[PDB]
Design a protein around this nucleic acid. Sequence first.
DNA 1: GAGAATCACGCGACTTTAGTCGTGTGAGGTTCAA
DNA 2: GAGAATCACGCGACTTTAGTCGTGTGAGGTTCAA
DNA 3: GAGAATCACGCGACTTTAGTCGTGTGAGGTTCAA
DNA 4: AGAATCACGCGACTTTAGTCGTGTGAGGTTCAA
Lengths: 141, 139, 135, 139
Amino acid sequence: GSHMTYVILPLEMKKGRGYVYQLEYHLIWCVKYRHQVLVGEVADGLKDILRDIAAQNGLEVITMEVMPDHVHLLLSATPQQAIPDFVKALKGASARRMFVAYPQLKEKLWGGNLWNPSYCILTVSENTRAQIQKYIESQHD
Amino acid sequence: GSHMTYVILPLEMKKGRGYVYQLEYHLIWCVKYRHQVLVGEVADGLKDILRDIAAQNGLEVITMEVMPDHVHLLLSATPQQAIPDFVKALKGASARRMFVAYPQLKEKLWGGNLWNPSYCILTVSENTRAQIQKYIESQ
Amino acid sequence: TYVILPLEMKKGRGYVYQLEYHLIWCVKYRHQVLVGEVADGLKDILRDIAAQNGLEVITMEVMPDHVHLLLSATPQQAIPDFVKALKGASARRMFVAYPQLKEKLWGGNLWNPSYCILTVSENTRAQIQKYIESQ
Amino acid sequence: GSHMTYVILPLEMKKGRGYVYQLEYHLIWCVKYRHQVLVGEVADGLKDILRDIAAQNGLEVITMEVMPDHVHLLLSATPQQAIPDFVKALKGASARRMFVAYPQLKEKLWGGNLWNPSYCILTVSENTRAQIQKYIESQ
DNA sequence: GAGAATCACGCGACTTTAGTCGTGTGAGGTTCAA
DNA sequence: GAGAATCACGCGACTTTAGTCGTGTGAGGTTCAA
DNA sequence: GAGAATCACGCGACTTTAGTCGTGTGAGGTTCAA
DNA sequence: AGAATCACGCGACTTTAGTCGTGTGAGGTTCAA
Ligand SMILES: [Mg+2]
Ligand SMILES: [Mg+2]
Ligand SMILES: [Mg+2]
Ligand SMILES: [Mg+2]
């Protein structure tokens, strides 16, 4: 026999002047020519640089994984932080700082680019789209 | 007793000049003073207005539910479509058009506002943050 | 602050439940015979058996060499019993309705003697465990 | 335009004579009259009893939480283990053993029942139903 | 004041030989929601 | 590439009185992965 | 052998004043998939 | 007894009205998605 039940859960979302939000993004990008250079101290240095850039731009880093040829970040941002801006900030500044800190990168990357010119980004929720859709439907009546 | 099986999962994404993406947002906002005015043809008129605005701004509507005192939207956008810009377009233009199309709203909303000044927005994924974090960890 | 999430369930005399199973089984020898009208007939037969046994079919997909079913059941409906009901009866009926199946299946079996079954929930196990901790 | 992504992910499953399966259940039940007696050593004793019964019956305990007035179990079973049978084994035997081990429970429960006569049970999967259905479509 | 999953009473099966499971039904009997 | 879920043979229960479920075991007998 | 996200060349905008983002196009120039 | 929500201030820009951006404070159409 059909029976709708309910569950109570604590809602911990971020608040701002005229907005309440919870915005997370899975951002991915590769090394130019997919060169496997992000290893050892180079990988460690990149993490420090990224976390610094994130802090400077008020971006919260949830998850950061550096693979030899690409990076995976899960960031939390405000509604005012446009995607292209923070991607540029992260990739552009890190490329600059990385070449300075690790000139040896120029051995495989002498064309003036550390990163692939493309980025991959997906919105991330705690639960799923389908689950959110049911929540919305349950709001009627 | 267990054996590790593995399956293939499909994921629909969009492509642009220098980016691959899948961006969806759950946007919510209420009626000013939380007045239950979004009912009957008022609600239907709002849906038509919102879909028009969305289409004009190149925003894909995944879900649109209009409750008496608030609206729930699920939108799909490009990386170049900033949040405040589309929220403004949606709320601002709809408030204007709604008052012109349904002047009777002024009975309970005479202060020049149809919408509460605040909006609530959440990023949306087909998989859970936990699942995604597990995926990331499996390199 | 607080959010009220919905959860659809069923009720019986002394129990509240939500039981769904993803059931899978293949054709004997993995022959690709479930095509065209044979596939359509199978679906009719399976829905009928499901109805006769009070099993709700949520999803059903018939591939040339195997079947996928997502069923809803009561706590009292034991797995082996409904799997037997679905496979045994469908095998019988299919052979009568489609004697052409005997071309590649003459040994008296339409189905592989094994079945695959997984329990299914609306939320992941991880989500459920998180809810459990919040109690 | 669109881009179609495909990711590979693991899935644990058990094998038996004529079946391959992964069956988990979230079982819940409350104390009779919802009395908050499952505390301290009483709660601890219950856990030992439940794990013993589960082991005696070949049921694997994935998660077990004992609140003052109810119990949450996440069990893993074979296709042959019928729900009513294992619910009876767990609640019935624990009620019996608990009263003998902790006679003090009789203070609030003198009617011969430790448990509410009802039980709640849900099938559990590692992935969500929507994802599973989505998979079924991909084949 | 009143229903059920939850309270109470009936019943059969079966382990735990007590106190659940299966189960129909009604009333103020230790209950009020996981 | 031979072991099993899947092939084969045995067994009892029970619906579909055929061909599954329950089940142990071994060989080359229509199989090869959902 | 030849397309783009990824390789290359064009182009503003703006930080990191270098090397991204925005962006159109095309060719065998350090690339081949998160 | 505060703020997201109520009110008053303020540019920017569409919808030239009523949002977005935004700081502050008072009790003045509000009380939670
Ligand atoms: Mg670029
Ligand atoms: Mg605002
Ligand atoms: Mg079998
Ligand atoms: Mg009972």
